[PDB]
Write a protein that binds this ligand. Structure first.
Ligand SMILES: [Mn+2]
Length: 264
């Protein structure tokens, strides 16, 4: 019943992996006129999206294959890349960063509960819904060195086996990027960047609060097993940190906390 011609294309939202993502309008059904995003993959990701149900992870609405293509219909996230906020702000105040990192952490917990690893928390991959809340959305295939590797754990870069700990590293890299204006370890070229990540000689800016510095130091560690969040408490361990002292969690999850930016 549901099929590719139930939607008209409005614009291209992005290429990536081996697919296109369109903003579309549904023209049939009760949801006639309702707006969505549609990822078209030219014949995994669908399984992850089917399994998840979290306020901070994107909703899969319809999925189907017809012809060669595989079609995933996802909620439209008019809020945009979190990346665009950071780009305009230059550097987030810790209040701002804390909000986003707090929501991302609950999403990360949910995924790890399902045995899912996100690998790469680059801010271009974090989307915002219309209210300005966090949505993890891209669980596609793209392949490790194809894009930027600056938010990835060293044990991912030198393929030596890894688990959910890589995600807490990436949270720290992102946090560093939010607070300083660039990711922790940047080379002049590719090879020099990689080496800098492996050596993991962390440079804490003197201006960050003690809480902000201590969380960064516990997240960005070469030894995966000893990262905050690498332990059995996973996201709870991280959410416990005094950097997240003002975070009413039950309300954050309920999306009753107001985001630092309303894309509007
Ligand atoms: Mn690739």
């Amino acid at each position: 019943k549901i099929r590719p011609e139930c939607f008209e294309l409005l614009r291209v939202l992005g290429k990536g992996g081996y697919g296109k993502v369109f903003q579309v309008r549904k023209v049939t059904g009760a949801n006639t006129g309702k707006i969505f995003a549609m990822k078209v993959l030219k014949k995994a990701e669908r399984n992850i999206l089917e399994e998840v149900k979290h306020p901070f992870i994107v909703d899969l609405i319809y999925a189907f294959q017809t012809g060669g293509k595989l079609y995933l219909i996802l909620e439209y996230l008019s809020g945009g890349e979190l990346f665009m906020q950071l780009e305009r702000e230059g550097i987030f105040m810790e209040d701002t960063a804390c909000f986003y990192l707090a929501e991302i952490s609950m999403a990360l917990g949910h995924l790890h509960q399902k045995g899912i690893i996100y690998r790469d928390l680059k801010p271009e991959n974090i989307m915002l819904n219309h209210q300005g809340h966090v949505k993890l959305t891209d669980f596609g295939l793209c392949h490790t060195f194809c894009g930027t590797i600056e938010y990835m754990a060293p044990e991912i870069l030198m393929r030596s086996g890894h688990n959910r700990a890589v995600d807490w590293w990436s949270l720290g890299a992102l946090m560093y990027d939010m607070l300083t204006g660039a990711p922790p370890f940047t080379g002049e070229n590719r090879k020099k960047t990689i080496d800098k990540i492996l050596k993991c000689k962390l440079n804490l800016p003197p201006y960050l609060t003690q809480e902000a510095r201590d969380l960064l130091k516990k997240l960005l560690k070469r030894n995966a097993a000893s990262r905050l969040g690498a332990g059995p408490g996973d996201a709870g361990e991280v959410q416990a940190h005094p950097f997240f002292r003002h975070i009413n969690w039950e309300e954050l999850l309920a999306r009753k906390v107001e985001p630092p930016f309303k894309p509007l």
